[PDB]
Amino acid sequence: MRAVRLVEIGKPLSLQEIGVPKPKGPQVLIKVEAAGVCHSDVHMRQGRFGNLRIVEDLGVKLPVTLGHEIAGKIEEVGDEVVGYSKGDLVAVNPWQGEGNCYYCRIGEEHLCDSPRWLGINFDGAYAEYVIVPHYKYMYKLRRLNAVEAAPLTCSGITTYRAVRKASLDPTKTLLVVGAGGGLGTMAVQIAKAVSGATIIGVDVREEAVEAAKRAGADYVINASMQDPLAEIRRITESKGVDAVIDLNNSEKTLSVYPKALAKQGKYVMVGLFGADLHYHAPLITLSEIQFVGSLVGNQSDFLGIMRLAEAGKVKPMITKTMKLEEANEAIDNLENFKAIGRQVLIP
Amino acid sequence: MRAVRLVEIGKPLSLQEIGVPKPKGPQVLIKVEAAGVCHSDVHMRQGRFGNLRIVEDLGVKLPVTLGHEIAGKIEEVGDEVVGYSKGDLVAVNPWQGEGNCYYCRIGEEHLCDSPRWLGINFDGAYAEYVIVPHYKYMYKLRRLNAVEAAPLTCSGITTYRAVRKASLDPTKTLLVVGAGGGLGTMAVQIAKAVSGATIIGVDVREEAVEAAKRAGADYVINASMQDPLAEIRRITESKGVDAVIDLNNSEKTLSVYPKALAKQGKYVMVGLFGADLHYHAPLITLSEIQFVGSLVGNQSDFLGIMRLAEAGKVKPMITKTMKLEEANEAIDNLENFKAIGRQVLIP
Amino acid sequence: MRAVRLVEIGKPLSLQEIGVPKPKGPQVLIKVEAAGVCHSDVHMRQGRFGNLRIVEDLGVKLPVTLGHEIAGKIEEVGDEVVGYSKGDLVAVNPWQGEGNCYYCRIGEEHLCDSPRWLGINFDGAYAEYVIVPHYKYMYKLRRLNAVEAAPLTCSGITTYRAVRKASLDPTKTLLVVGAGGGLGTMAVQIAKAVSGATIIGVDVREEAVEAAKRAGADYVINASMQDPLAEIRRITESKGVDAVIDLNNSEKTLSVYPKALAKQGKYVMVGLFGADLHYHAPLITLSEIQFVGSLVGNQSDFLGIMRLAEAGKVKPMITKTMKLEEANEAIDNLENFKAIGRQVLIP
Amino acid sequence: MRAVRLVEIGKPLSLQEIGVPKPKGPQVLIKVEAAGVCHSDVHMRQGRFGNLRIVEDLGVKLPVTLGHEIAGKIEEVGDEVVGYSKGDLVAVNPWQGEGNCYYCRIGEEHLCDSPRWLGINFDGAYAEYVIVPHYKYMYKLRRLNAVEAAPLTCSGITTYRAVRKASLDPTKTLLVVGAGGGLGTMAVQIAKAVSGATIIGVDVREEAVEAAKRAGADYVINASMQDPLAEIRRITESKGVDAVIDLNNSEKTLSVYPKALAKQGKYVMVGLFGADLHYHAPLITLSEIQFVGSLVGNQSDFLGIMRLAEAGKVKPMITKTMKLEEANEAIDNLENFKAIGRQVLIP
Ligand SMILES: [Zn+2]
Ligand SMILES: [Zn+2]
Ligand SMILES: [Zn+2]
Ligand SMILES: [Zn+2]
Ligand SMILES: [Zn+2]
Ligand SMILES: [Zn+2]
Ligand SMILES: [Zn+2]
Ligand SMILES: [Zn+2]
Numbered sequence A, B, C, D: 001m002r003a004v005r006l007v008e009i010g011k012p013l014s015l016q017e018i019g020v021p022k023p024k025g026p027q028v029l030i031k032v033e034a035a036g037v038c039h040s041d042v043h044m045r046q047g048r049f050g051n052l053r054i055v056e057d058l059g060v061k062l063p064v065t066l067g068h069e070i071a072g073k074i075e076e077v078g079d080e081v082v083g084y085s086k087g088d089l090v091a092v093n094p095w096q097g098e099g100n101c102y103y104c105r106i107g108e109e110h111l112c113d114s115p116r117w118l119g120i121n122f123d124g125a126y127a128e129y130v131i132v133p134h135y136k137y138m139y140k141l142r143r144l145n146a147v148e149a150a151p152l153t154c155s156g157i158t159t160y161r162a163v164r165k166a167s168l169d170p171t172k173t174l175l176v177v178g179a180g181g182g183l184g185t186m187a188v189q190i191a192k193a194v195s196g197a198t199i200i201g202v203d204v205r206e207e208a209v210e211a212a213k214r215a216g217a218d219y220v221i222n223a224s225m226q227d228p229l230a231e232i233r234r235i236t237e238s239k240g241v242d243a244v245i246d247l248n249n250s251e252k253t254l255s256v257y258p259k260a261l262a263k264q265g266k267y268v269m270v271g272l273f274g275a276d277l278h279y280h281a282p283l284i285t286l287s288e289i290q291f292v293g294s295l296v297g298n299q300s301d302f303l304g305i306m307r308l309a310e311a312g313k314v315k316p317m318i319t320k321t322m323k324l325e326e327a328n329e330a331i332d333n334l335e336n337f338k339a340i341g342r343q344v345l346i347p
Helices: A039-044 A146-153 A155-165 A182-194 A206-215 A228-235 A281-287 A299-310 A324-335 B039-044 B146-153 B155-165 B182-194 B206-215 B228-235 B281-287 B299-310 B324-335 C039-044 C146-153 C155-165 C182-194 C206-215 C228-235 C281-287 C299-310 C324-335 D039-044 D146-153 D155-165 D182-194 D206-215 D228-235 D281-287 D299-310 D324-335
Strands: A002-006 A014-017 A028-037 A069-077 A089-092 A129-132 A138-140 A173-177 A198-203 A219-222 A241-246 A261-269 A276-280 A290-293 A319-323 A342-346 B002-006 B014-017 B028-037 B069-077 B089-092 B129-132 B138-140 B173-177 B198-203 B219-222 B241-246 B261-269 B276-280 B290-293 B319-323 B342-346 C002-006 C014-017 C028-037 C069-077 C089-092 C129-132 C138-140 C173-177 C198-203 C219-222 C241-246 C261-269 C276-280 C290-293 C319-323 C342-346 D002-006 D014-017 D028-037 D069-077 D089-092 D129-132 D138-140 D173-177 D198-203 D219-222 D241-246 D261-269 D276-280 D290-293 D319-323 D342-346
Touching (some): A028 A146, A039 A324, A069 A129, A089 A146, A146 A299, A155 A261, A173 A182, A182 A299, A206 A219, A276 A281, A276 B281, A281 B261, A290 B281, A324 A342, B028 B146, B138 B299, B146 B299, B146 B342, B155 B182, B155 B241, B182 B206, B182 B299, B198 B228, B206 B219, B276 B281, C002 C324, C028 C146, C039 C324, C069 C129, C146 C342, C155 C182, C155 C241, C173 C182, C182 C206, C198 C206, C198 C228, C206 C219, C219 C228, C276 C281, C276 D281, C281 D276, D002 D324, D028 D089, D028 D146, D069 D146, D138 D299, D146 D319, D155 D241, D155 D261, D155 D299, D173 D182, D182 D299, D206 D219, D219 D228, D276 D281, D319 D324, D324 D342
Parallel strands (some): A173 A241, C173 C198, C173 C241, C241 C261, D173 D198, D198 D219, D241 D261, D319 D342
Antiparallel strands (some): A002 A014, A028 A069, A028 A342, A069 A089, A089 A138, B028 B069, B069 B089, B089 B138, C028 C069, C028 C129, C089 C138, D028 D129, D028 D342, D069 D089, D089 D138
16 A cells, blocks of 8 residues: 655655555554644654654654544454444544553543554554554544544644633633634634633734634734734733633743733643743742643543534634645645645545 | 831831721721741831732832731621621631632632732731731631641641642642741641642751651652652652642752653642743643642632641641740841741730 | 512512612612512512521511512612722622631532522512622623623523533533523523533423524424433433433423433432432442532622623523512412513513 | 352352463453452342343353452463563452443543443452453552452442542541441541541441541441431531441431531442432522432542552451352351451452
8 A cells, every 4th residue: 555654854755555454453444535734744754743753752663654633434443343334434533542551541541651643653644544553542423524524633632622721611711822823713613612711812914813703713813913912901801811722832922922811820832842931930829820731632632522523513624635645745835834724635 | 006017118127006906897806816927028028929019019008017827816896797706716817808809709819809918918917906807717716726826827828729739639649849848848748638649758958858757748858868850750650740839939949840740740839939930831732731820828728727727637837936026036037047937926 | 769578478579668778888789770580589479499488497587678680770889899880780699698607718609508698588679779788799781781681690690500510511411401491591502602512402392492492402302292311312322411400300300301311420400399309329329420409609600601691602581571560460470380581670 | 270150140159160261462361369259249149230130231141250359460461461570469450441432531431331340240350360351450569468459449449439529628527327347447548548528437336436436537426326417417517518428328328318418518329239319309409419429430540549558548458368169158248247357269
């Protein structure tokens, strides 16, 4: 079968012809119908996930097939698979754990000490077929097709968990930084569908500010034309927001938005490539604010985003379909910031 | 009556002879039997609480009587007081709110937008009598005497809340920084009485390391004679601790202990005078750690520490009693780090 | 001023001409613009709240002015009122506590040991003016008028809290019993605005089933034309629902709906006049289900429903306005089940 | 190997000579060093778990080897086992799930839709060796020996979870019914080690009342010599207790103890063989009490009880060791209420 893989850090991804794996036990072989491509793949091409080296830190022995945003049809099942049949269309949760470590035992499998992350340190969906280590990491698709579901396994689950980490309720206000981008509009949609909180979206280009409003933001701010902090203080009557979801954590956002927090406010950091946070510790104590990290999501987060999406309560991302052979090009587009919409490869 | 007050920032506290207030409505007049003195008073003498100026930022019109650690006997009650009688011995919660703002409505009265903090921006216990704005902020003492109870209204409630913010359970491990000091041993005692968590205490002098062990720490580390990070990694089998209660937040502690955190670990900051936190944002995201502030406590925190102390489940601080006239001297002792034990003034 | 009051249990409510109270301290005098009338008043006329006798059990000394659903304009304020002015239009939270008891200290003021419930054991809004014991129990109205806001102080807060007690999230399904009635459609609206959960509504008349659907239910069941349990098992794929909000707790509902619960399901009981629950204890243990009571709401619940309503996130109840003199008639209508929509008196 | 099994409901357990299983994949073969026997086995001999028939309702095809309280040494491991070696002494969590259903995905594996309960519907420890389906369900023993650890996998985990369901904190009081029995003293010990709550223990014989006190109860009541309700009202100053852990749920306990609950009190039911609960629904609503079931425990509960026990924070049950051949006799002892201490079989 065809597979686009990282063969050498410093070279582009390479198309190889390799054998189709045979699933055993609880494994499932999926015939890929959609392989999402996101900014994380710009770094995977460089052999990094966050600051982590996939070879040195995650134990990867190259080559590895990329593609952590997976949906497709069941091709074959191992003899211990229960509850699924050949032909079923499913989305896959790639953030898998092994079961024995502390994090797995308490239900936070994505923080597993020996992770099994498909498309990151295990072979992924940039191929005609892909092995899912255990059938429990799937979700049958009824309303969505593969292209609509694939991006949700990464962007959907990530923002779903970040909204949960924001600990919202109707008495509160949420600020989403970069609310008009793909990730930002997904966060706005989820917050509007699940919390009852007042949602403020901020961005810097007019199109983006409009997309945030289309996504459901109650208030939107164009940081290029208005002082964001002053607008936030006006909207919240000087209280500040009870949570910020910062999808960037750049020198730029970290130097402004933490100032928008209300007492006990939660600053949820979702970016994997940003700056250092510099903040006066005594002010964190006096205001009881919290700086909290959020990474992808666990099985419960996966079930939640899939259930929302399958019920039509949040809408799929804007996508552009491409061929498996254009994988390098898709990643190039993200590097050069020329990508419009979420790119999805169709093998 | 006699009252020691801040009359001019830059001068020592001044003893004045002023009228005894007459309580009305829900107010209670207390005849002071114990007025605790803590490091916060070294700053109050300078007109500051944390980085806040009590005049500019809190609205104080000097002079103001200090003393936020209060216990004594009820002298007189206003006509709306219910459930207490003249002669009752009580401890007082000084971190009072007004009721209408967001924080009061959700039960976090200490974060009130227009706080009524006795001994800080309202007259306190460095006097023969003190007015308690509402009787609901008291707790009748049965087992403890005033001197034993007074420090708990500040140090006890502060560490009780910090232990709550650490979100401990038996599957977890807590690290208390500065575990041998007065605040540190109180935190160790509370954690041992209320969480079931494994408790690691760290300090830098041999006496302190021993006091932490007496307080109940399961493991204690002398940071002067051992590498604290290596010991923590050994004790936790490389996982790191699920929470750190840092009672200092100095350049010193902030540069070491956040490294001891396990994934999803909570770094609880309780210090009001420290440095800046500098931490790589992407590492907060990848590990899902949290930096969280904790300040004094709310009514529920007050009820909890008082209930634990009145049941003998935690022990009173080591104290040294002094006269109301020695207030300046007591504060001098804390400035010069010559104070042994918690100083308590007896009018 | 005119006031309609309970003067003798066994007689209809009596119109009296009494003095206008003068507010002092934190009290506020409100000029009533809307006084909601609900089924609770059918029982108040009989001197009962639930099975409680307001005289014997709550300490009421007759006569008492009814009306616990209050909105109006500030007429006068006591000298300690802050943050409100004469002329402000506000809704009032009538479920007030005194501050000192356990329940008040932990922020559950409605469960106060010595409650101050306006319209129940304290004079209410069936009069030209009404005293609010403390200004913190109000909410300024901007988007809603008094008639739209008044019912929310009882029906809105009650269902808002019941939805919270149901502990919903997007992975779950909620069943609302009696989903087409005034209370039922309010519960459906709140659940749809704040949880992300799949919502099933059940009722027994065609109009009601339609109103539940208009309210936002994802699935609605006509219990008269379909087997509710079989439909629930079909919709939930045999799992059952994760929560039921039972607004009646009649012999009828209690004998059917607890059977619809999934393992760990929460059966939230909101009715004040129902039957006995009879359930095999071993089945509660084996399935980990929970039977949980929910009564009116606390300050946080009041803030939440008011914020949702003021943001247009839930819609006001269908109302019918009437004169203060028609109070007895309004209650008669509820007794005879002839009331259409929520009746609101306008003094 | 020797194995004592249920071969026919209506006959005593039968000793058979069967093959030793060979573990594959993540399975582990354990050489049994301790097989606890509890009241649940009196019912297993009758083919029942609670009211469930293990054949009709759980799908068991007889014969099945009993023994759900397991500790022993690793004999052999399948090729996917990581983190354990031959010879390691471990306790096993028998309440296993399959991974795909709702309950498994949210971390409540014991409520799995297709449970794998060792000693109940899967072969257990009443044999020389036993297969553990996945290595993640074990805990290495360092401080405890097999006989001390085995009972904890059932009684320890059950009471640990019930204490968690009681939602205790230092501001609250817990009542443990039957506090002097094996299960009762374990509940008292756990509550004392993990909550900070005031603990009241009640029982009916003098020895039992004393054992409850030895276990750590702050207050103990002899229901045979004192009115339990009056004593509870005295101790709690008329408030009632915030939680009751009822280990029986008999007509007897259910008719008395729910009356001891304070408003918002949680009545935690742990018994598998009791009566029907009959309670006036309007009183549940008015007081916001909760009746909540608790069954065995999940992976997080297992980790917690094992960590407490391995740290010496709770003590092992009083045990009496016996031979595998005396299994029927051990169960007879429990039937005739002649068993003193927890019986543990040693193959
Ligand atoms: Zn992605
Ligand atoms: Zn793991
Ligand atoms: Zn202090
Ligand atoms: Zn306030
Ligand atoms: Zn009402
Ligand atoms: Zn109260
Ligand atoms: Zn057992
Ligand atoms: Zn399962």
